[PDB]
Amino acid sequence: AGTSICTSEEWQGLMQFTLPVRLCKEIELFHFDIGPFENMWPGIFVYMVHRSCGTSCFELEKLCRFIMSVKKNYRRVPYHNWKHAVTVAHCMYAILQNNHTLFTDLERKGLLIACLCHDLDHRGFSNSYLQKFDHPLAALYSTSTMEQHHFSQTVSILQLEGHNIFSTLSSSEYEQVLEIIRKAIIATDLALYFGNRKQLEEMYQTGSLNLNNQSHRDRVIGLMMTACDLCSVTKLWPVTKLTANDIYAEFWAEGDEMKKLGIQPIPMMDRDKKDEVPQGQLGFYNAVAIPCYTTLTQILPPTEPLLKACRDNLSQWEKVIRGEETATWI
Ligand SMILES: Nc1cc(Cl)nc(N)n1
Numbered sequence: 275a276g277t278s279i280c281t282s283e284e285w286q287g288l289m290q291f292t293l294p295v296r297l298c299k300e301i302e303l304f305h306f307d308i309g310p311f312e313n314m315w316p317g318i319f320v321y322m323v324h325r326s327c328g329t330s331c332f333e334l335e336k337l338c339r340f341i342m343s344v345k346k347n348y349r350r351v352p353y354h355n356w357k358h359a360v361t362v363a364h365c366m367y368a369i370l371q372n373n374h375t376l377f378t379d380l381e382r383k384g385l386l387i388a389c390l391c392h393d394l395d396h397r398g399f400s401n402s403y404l405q406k407f408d409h410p411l412a413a414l415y416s417t418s419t420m421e422q423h424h425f426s427q428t429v430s431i432l433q434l435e436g437h438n439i440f441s442t443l444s445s446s447e448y449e450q451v452l453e454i455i456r457k458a459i460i461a462t463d464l465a466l467y468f469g470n471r472k473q474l475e476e477m478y479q480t481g482s483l484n485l486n487n488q489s490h491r492d493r494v495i496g497l498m499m500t501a502c503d504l505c506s507v508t509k510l511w512p513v514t515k516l517t518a519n520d521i522y523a524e525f526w527a528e529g530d531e532m533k534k535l536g537i538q539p540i541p542m543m544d545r546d547k548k549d550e551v552p553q554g555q556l557g558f559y560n561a562v563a564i565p566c567y568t569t570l571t572q573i574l575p576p577t578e579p580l581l582k583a584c585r586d587n588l589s590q591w592e593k594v595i596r597g598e599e600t601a602t603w604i
Pocket residue numbers: 503504506507518521558
């Protein structure tokens with residue numbers, strides 16, 4: 275029921291927040307893991323917007339209201355939560371810092387906000403679920419159901435009194451940024467990823483890819499959104515392994531719901547099929563993450579460390595399968 279608004283207490287605090295010095299250099303790296311710094315997450319987001327877009331990109335008060343209200347519109351679900359939002363935004367920051375001039379000031383502001391907002395009000399249910407059991411959302415949004423919902427929630431937050439960080443933009447630029455943000459959130463539907471990646475791969479291989487071609491730009495941005503959304507697979511193995519427990523915790527709760535409604539879930543959502551997870555992650559890396567980061571690296575060479583990390587994690591899942599796992603804490 276409705277869109278949640280942060281307290282004066284919340285946003286004034288973030289305004290007064292300052293980032294410990296040692297973290298400045300860390301935040302720049304692809305592999306950086308926000309995990310051990312929970313109190314600082316909203317502040318790390320300020321810092322990234324200020325570094326990428328400049329301290330004058332947004333009136334700070336409205337930026338701070340926007341971020342903390344964004345936080346309050348994430349749910350307490352094991353995975354599609356506030357921590358994932360900031361993780362995704364950080365990956366985008368590393369991509370943009372490493373490819374800064376390829377992207378307009380409008381694209382950078384739009385994309386960091388899109389990443390932070392891309393799973394707003396996620397309920398711990400997949401599009402598969404909502405469409406299977408005809409949730410009202412599936413009727414409103416026949417395809418990319420939750421993603422269209424996340425964009426809707428983003429616009430609602432902006433429309434809160436004192437939250438509209440895009441107000442100072444020309445009328446034309448405003449429409450462009452909302453369009454940037456809409457396309458970027460929609461692209462985080464993995465259903466679209468398969469065709470997008472295949473197109474981009476084709477365009478790269480034939481040499482037709484042209485970044486001054488809007489339709490090409492939209493697709494590159496789309497794959498960037500995929501890379502950022504899946505970035506848990508690009509971290510150090512223990513970090514990757516730990517996040518995966520959260521991914522599966524959320525899936526298995528969905529599977530539990532399906533069982534009550536007389537449908538056996540897919541194995542991935544079946545908590546009594548845990549022995550199949552390492553092989554499922556192997557399949558997910560083979561069909562999704564590997565090709566994603568491969569293509570992204572061809573298009574944006576400086577993103578190559580995301581790909582090497584993901585190949586290292588693939589190998590770690592293969593070790594698990596062979597029975598060579600050593601001690602893991604969770
Ligand atoms: N977003 C996801 C989904 C699955 Cl099955 N696995 C990973 N690593 N990330």
